[PDB]
Write a protein that binds this ligand. Structure first.
Ligand SMILES: *[C@@H]1O[C@H](CO)[C@@H](O[C@@H]2O[C@H](CO)[C@@H](O[C@@H]3O[C@H](CO[C@H]4O[C@H](CO)[C@@H](O)[C@H](O)[C@@H]4O)[C@@H](O)[C@H](O[C@H]4O[C@H](CO[C@H]5O[C@H](CO)[C@@H](O)[C@H](O)[C@@H]5O)[C@@H](O)[C@H](O)[C@@H]4O)[C@@H]3O)[C@H](O)[C@H]2NC(C)=O)[C@H](O)[C@H]1NC(C)=O
Ligand SMILES: *[C@@H]1O[C@H](CO)[C@@H](O[C@@H]2O[C@H](CO)[C@@H](O[C@@H]3O[C@H](CO)[C@@H](O)[C@H](O[C@H]4O[C@H](CO)[C@@H](O)[C@H](O)[C@@H]4O)[C@@H]3O)[C@H](O)[C@H]2NC(C)=O)[C@H](O)[C@H]1NC(C)=O
Ligand SMILES: *[C@@H]1O[C@H](CO)[C@@H](O[C@@H]2O[C@H](CO)[C@@H](O[C@@H]3O[C@H](CO[C@H]4O[C@H](CO)[C@@H](O)[C@H](O)[C@@H]4O)[C@@H](O)[C@H](O)[C@@H]3O)[C@H](O)[C@H]2NC(C)=O)[C@H](O)[C@H]1NC(C)=O
Ligand SMILES: *[C@@H]1O[C@H](CO)[C@@H](O[C@@H]2O[C@H](CO)[C@@H](O[C@@H]3O[C@H](CO)[C@@H](O)[C@H](O)[C@@H]3O)[C@H](O)[C@H]2NC(C)=O)[C@H](O)[C@H]1NC(C)=O
Ligand SMILES: *[C@@H]1O[C@H](CO)[C@@H](O[C@@H]2O[C@H](CO)[C@@H](O[C@@H]3O[C@H](CO)[C@@H](O)[C@H](O)[C@@H]3O)[C@H](O)[C@H]2NC(C)=O)[C@H](O)[C@H]1NC(C)=O
Ligand SMILES: *[C@@H]1O[C@H](CO)[C@@H](O[C@@H]2O[C@H](CO)[C@@H](O[C@@H]3O[C@H](CO)[C@@H](O)[C@H](O)[C@@H]3O)[C@H](O)[C@H]2NC(C)=O)[C@H](O)[C@H]1NC(C)=O
Ligand SMILES: *[C@@H]1O[C@H](CO)[C@@H](O[C@@H]2O[C@H](CO)[C@@H](O[C@@H]3O[C@H](CO)[C@@H](O)[C@H](O)[C@@H]3O)[C@H](O)[C@H]2NC(C)=O)[C@H](O)[C@H]1NC(C)=O
Ligand SMILES: *[C@@H]1O[C@H](CO)[C@@H](O[C@@H]2O[C@H](CO)[C@@H](O)[C@H](O)[C@H]2NC(C)=O)[C@H](O)[C@H]1NC(C)=O
Ligand SMILES: *[C@@H]1O[C@H](CO)[C@@H](O[C@@H]2O[C@H](CO)[C@@H](O)[C@H](O)[C@H]2NC(C)=O)[C@H](O)[C@H]1NC(C)=O
Ligand SMILES: C[C@@H]1O[C@@H](Oc2ccc([N+](=O)[O-])cc2)[C@H](O)[C@H](O)[C@H]1O
Ligand SMILES: *[C@@H]1O[C@H](CO)[C@@H](O)[C@H](O)[C@H]1NC(C)=O
Ligand SMILES: *[C@@H]1O[C@H](CO)[C@@H](O)[C@H](O)[C@H]1NC(C)=O
Length: 630
């Protein structure tokens, strides 16, 4: 396994805290609970906050060697961010109030106390052991069984990335570990058990809803929600594919979502047991997820199984396209952003992307009948979207035909999809989006004074696709170095969202501690750095066809790789002064692909010796194997 040192995931599922952060009261040998030899003696009312170093998850067990009064109690509290360390409560999961400590009456006697997976804590970095009674207790250990990525070898990555920019490397591996943390045992889902409260009052919590079929599944957030969400998949899937390659949790998630499709084709806002809600964009995201799951797995059986449902969902989306040629949205539910309605640039951009995905899929399946309608509809969406929604003055798309707001999501998606009329226009959008950056990242005005890493990943893809890799690297540094290195963060996983002023306030949530610090949809940098900076782009099922387009920017060394069922993809180059010194790549045998290197002239040689001339920095029909530039 390459670059194992960067993999954050624990080397054992039997975890003890790494270090002692704080001792309140009189506690002997607190470090005993960190693996150091000995026992920890809590003498009366006391507490100790321990730090795991990384975000972890699982079931706590308290090994009591001794207790005094039959009324002795040891509590355990958990939190992701250091902001919420308390001897009286955990961080929050519900729309209001903090969650209660797990209270183990150690007064009954010695032994190991635990409440099992019903009280799984999905994410926490700091753990507080609390002695709230005057009694003296002696504890041999307080440990956790790590229950994330439940059926995987945690450090057996199949993908890797390593650049000359160490901050980027750490961002990549933090995103991978975030995704590992969001993959859970499906029987421990739904942290929103409650679907007004002050610190004295604590909220009961439990994880005992089976959200999907199978033995593993990828949810939106480790601590919460622990439901399946289609929108997050639009980043989570590709970031999983190039790192752990645990597409099984993605598949169970997607299958659970499709099991809930309605007779009109409408796909769910979220998996069970969330309220039945109509969301144009999230139905579309279910379609995007199916398409990209086929793209990376190449599972023809699975695609055949679900093609009828996919076409029904496409038709449900197309039922909204009106006389204008654009979709007229009547469902405000989206990524928790406001103002979702009417002729949204984001909805129609996702729709264009979806229609092109569907055309590609139907050509792969030789289902030519729906192709003409889909192609014509997509072309009309493009035309009328640029006629009615393009603001040439401000260089952005507006949210709809009757507003002055230019959204980050809509413009990002309009660049990611080929909705722009020209490459020049994509460049204008990239520049205008970058001009809005604040001291803490890219803003999403459609959701108020919010910075959304979710939308930040799509902005990254836009910047890369406009010809601005270094703009995207600057956004990576500015935003994700904040999410990684801010002292309030976790330094291992990525946050769900925050505010433009640098506060961890997330506008839709009044309960600030319920903001989860481990969300898969914030892992855009992993797939972005692998696909765009390193240049390894799958363009066919499981990599049957591919495209090598490294966009190094001002990077001097870049090495990356991942795997599919066809074989191993690898990229490696070193530059200086705007010229490649070395460039090599590997693709699975039997595949054919193309290369776009830029203002690079010379010849590519195969392992056999086949020589191909770069014409405009390009090449075509290239067989699979180890190729090098001379
Ligand atoms: C600390 O936490 C860890 C979390 O990982 C616990 O370990 C896990 O325990 C579960 C218990 O079932 C194991 O699940 C089983 O996994 C089988 C495949 O295992 C794969 O991963 C291994 C990783 O090393 C690997 O070595 C192995 O070769 C293989 O690749 C899987 O075939 C089993 O299938 C059962 O479940 C299917 C899903 O439906 C069921 O879902 C729940 C599961 O909880 C169940 O309650 C429900 O009733 C459903 O039946 C089902 O379709 C099948 O018919 C079959 O019943 C099963 O999922 C998991 O592998 C363990 N992971 C690791 C890494 O060990 C660990 O136990 C815990 N500590 C303690 C002390 O308990
Ligand atoms: C996940 O965990 C939650 C708890 O955190 C759990 O919810 C609890 O479920 C139990 C059932 O397993 C509930 O207990 C029942 O509540 C009903 C309604 O109050 C009562 O009628 C039940 O009485 C039983 O016994 C009676 C005779 O004494 C019978 O007449 C009657 O028919 C019943 O057989 C029993 O008290 C409990 O109220 C809830 N609590 C909460 C807070 O939800 C949930 O079931 C778990 N989900 C799983 C495991 O899938
Ligand atoms: C065309 O696009 C325009 C630009 O997006 C749309 O106008 C937007 O409409 C929305 C919805 O009214 C406004 O959203 C704002 O939301 C905040 C917060 O409200 C939310 O949160 C509070 C709690 O804080 C909760 O109580 C609410 O129920 C919401 O869930 C409010 O403070 C604002 O007053 C407002 O409601 C946008 O501000 C608004 N933008 C602009 C520029 O007008 C327009 O709706 C679209 N066209 C159509 C036909 O829908
Ligand atoms: C240390 O913490 C434990 C765990 O919370 C405490 O045990 C708890 O004691 C309270 C006492 O009121 C119990 O609350 C409930 O009170 C109502 C009356 O308002 C009563 O009807 C309920 O039956 C219950 O007694 C709570 O259930 C109990 N928790 C457990 C798990 O037993 C303990 O008292 C604390 N010790 C000190 C010294 O603070
Ligand atoms: C081919 O694709 C087009 C989309 O470009 C589909 O046309 C659209 O179909 C929906 C219903 O599926 C129409 O919505 C309906 O509009 C009428 C008004 O005429 C309204 O009374 C209904 O209640 C409903 O809202 C939509 O207007 C229509 N748009 C256009 C431009 O035709 C068409 O269904 C697809 N055909 C096939 C065979 O897939
Ligand atoms: C993304 O969209 C751009 C346009 O916004 C596409 O480039 C355009 O491609 C069309 C054809 O797909 C060109 O229009 C026509 O091409 C035919 C040949 O097929 C020619 O006979 C006509 O005279 C006309 O030129 C158009 O010139 C071209 N424009 C530019 C600026 O490139 C691009 O292909 C799209 N990319 C993807 C991946 O979909
Ligand atoms: C936040 O995370 C970073 C890593 O992403 C932590 O910094 C890292 O700290 C380790 C030590 O725990 C450094 O490696 C060690 O170097 C020592 C020599 O001093 C050696 O004996 C060890 O075997 C190990 O190689 C690592 O270089 C360093 N990396 C960076 C980029 O700082 C940091 O401690 C974390 N901070 C918090 C508050 O969690
Ligand atoms: C140990 O006591 C300290 C107080 O010195 C606790 O820290 C406080 O935490 C609250 C949040 O619950 C903050 O609002 C306060 O600002 C903190 N105190 C100070 C002086 O800044 C800490 O939570 C306690 N830790 C344990 C494990 O009991
Ligand atoms: C887009 O959809 C909206 C509803 O989501 C339509 O709004 C209605 O338009 C009719 C026009 O005759 C008005 O009489 C109604 O009062 C409008 N609704 C409301 C709640 O006021 C709108 O017409 C649609 N536009 C297009 C072009 O299809
Ligand atoms: C649109 C979705 O919003 C969030 O889902 C939640 C739904 C309800 C509540 N709640 O009311 O507790 C909290 C979160 C979550 O970020 C998902 O990733 C995102 O796709
Ligand atoms: C998983 O599937 C079984 C039957 O195969 C079903 O009983 C169970 O409810 C399912 N769990 C879900 C859909 O979360
Ligand atoms: C590196 O940054 C400089 C700006 O200092 C820019 O001019 C140059 O184009 C960048 N290099 C590449 C390969 O884009």
């Amino acid at each position: 396994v390459p670059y194992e040192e960067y993999i954050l995931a624990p080397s054992s599922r039997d975890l003890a805290p790494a270090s002692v952060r704080q001792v309140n009261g009189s506690v002997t040998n607190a470090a005993a609970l960190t693996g150091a030899g000995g026992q920890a003696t809590f003498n009366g009312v006391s507490s100790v906050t321990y730090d795991f170093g990384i975000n972890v998850a699982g079931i706590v067990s308290v090994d009591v060697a001794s207790a005094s009064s039959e009324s002795a109690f040891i509590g355990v509290t958990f939190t992701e961010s250091s902001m919420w360390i308390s001897n009286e409560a955990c961080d929050a999961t519900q729309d209001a109030g903090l969650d209660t400590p797990l209270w183990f009456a150690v007064g009954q006697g010695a032994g190991v106390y635990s409440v099992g997976k019903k009280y799984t804590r999905g994410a926490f970095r700091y753990m507080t052991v609390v002695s709230n009674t005057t009694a003296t207790v002696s504890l041999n250990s307080v440990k956790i069984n790590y229950t994330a990525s439940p059926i995987q070898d945690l450090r057996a990555y199949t993908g890797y990335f390593h650049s000359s920019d160490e901050l980027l490397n750490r961002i990549w591996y933090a995103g991978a570990y975030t995704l590992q943390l969001c993959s859970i045992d499906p029987t421990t889902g739904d942290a929103l058990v409650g679907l007004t409260i002050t610190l004295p009052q604590t909220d009961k919590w439990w994880t005992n809803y089976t959200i999907t079929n199978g033995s593993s599944t990828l949810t939106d957030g480790a601590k919460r929600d622990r439901l399946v969400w289609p929108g997050d998949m639009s980043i989570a899937l590709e970031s999983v594919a190039v790192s752990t390659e645990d597409l099984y949790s993605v598949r169970t998630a997607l299958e659970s979502l499709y099991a809930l499709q309605k007779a009109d084709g409408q796909l769910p806002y979220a998996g069970k047991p969330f309220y039945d809600t109509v969301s144009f964009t999230y139905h579309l995201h279910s379609l995007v997820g199916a398409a990209s799951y086929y793209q990376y797995t190449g599972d023809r059986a699975w695609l055949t199984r679900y093609w009828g449902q996919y076409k029904k969902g496409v038709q449900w989306a197309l039922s909204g396209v009106d006389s204008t040629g654009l979709a007229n949205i009547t469902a405000s539910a989206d990524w928790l952003r406001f103002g979702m309605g009417a002729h949204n640039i984001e909805a129609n951009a996702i729709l264009y992307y979806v229609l092109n995905d569907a055309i590609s899929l139907a050509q792969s399946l030789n289902d030519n009948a729906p192709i003409r309608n889909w192609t014509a509809t997509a072309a009309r969406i493009k035309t009328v979207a640029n006629e009615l929604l393009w603001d040439d003055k401000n260089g952005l798309y507006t949210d709809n035909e009757t507003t002055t707001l230019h959204p980050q999501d809509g413009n990002s998606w309009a660049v990611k999809a080929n909705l722009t009329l020209s490459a020049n226009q994509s460049a204008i959008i990239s520049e205008s989006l970058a001009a809005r950056w604040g001291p803490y990242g890219a803003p999403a005005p459609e959701a108020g004074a919010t910075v959304s890493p979710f939308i930040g990943g799509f902005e990254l893809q836009a910047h890369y696709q406009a010809g601005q890799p270094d703009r995207a690297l600057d956004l990576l540094r500015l935003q994700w170095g904040f999410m990684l290195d801010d002292p309030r963060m976790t330094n291992s996983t990525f946050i769900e969202g925050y505010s433009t002023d640098g506060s961890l306030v997330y506008a839709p949530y009044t309960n600030r501690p319920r903001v989860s610090h481990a969300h898969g949809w914030s892992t855009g940098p992993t797939s972005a750095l692998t696909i765009y900076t390193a240049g390894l782009r799958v363009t066919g099922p499981a990599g049957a066809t591919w495209l090598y387009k490294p966009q190094p920017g001002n990077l001097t060394q870049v090495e990356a790789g991942f795997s599919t069922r066809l074989g191993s993809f690898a990229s490696s180059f070193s530059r200086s002064g705007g010229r490649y010194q070395e460039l090599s790549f590997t693709t699975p045998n039997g595949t054919t692909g193309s290369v776009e290197l830029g203002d690079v002239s010379g010849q590519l040689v195969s392992e056999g010796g086949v020589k191909v001339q770069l014409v405009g920095g390009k090449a075509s029909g290239l067989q699979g194997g180890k190729w090098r530039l001379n």
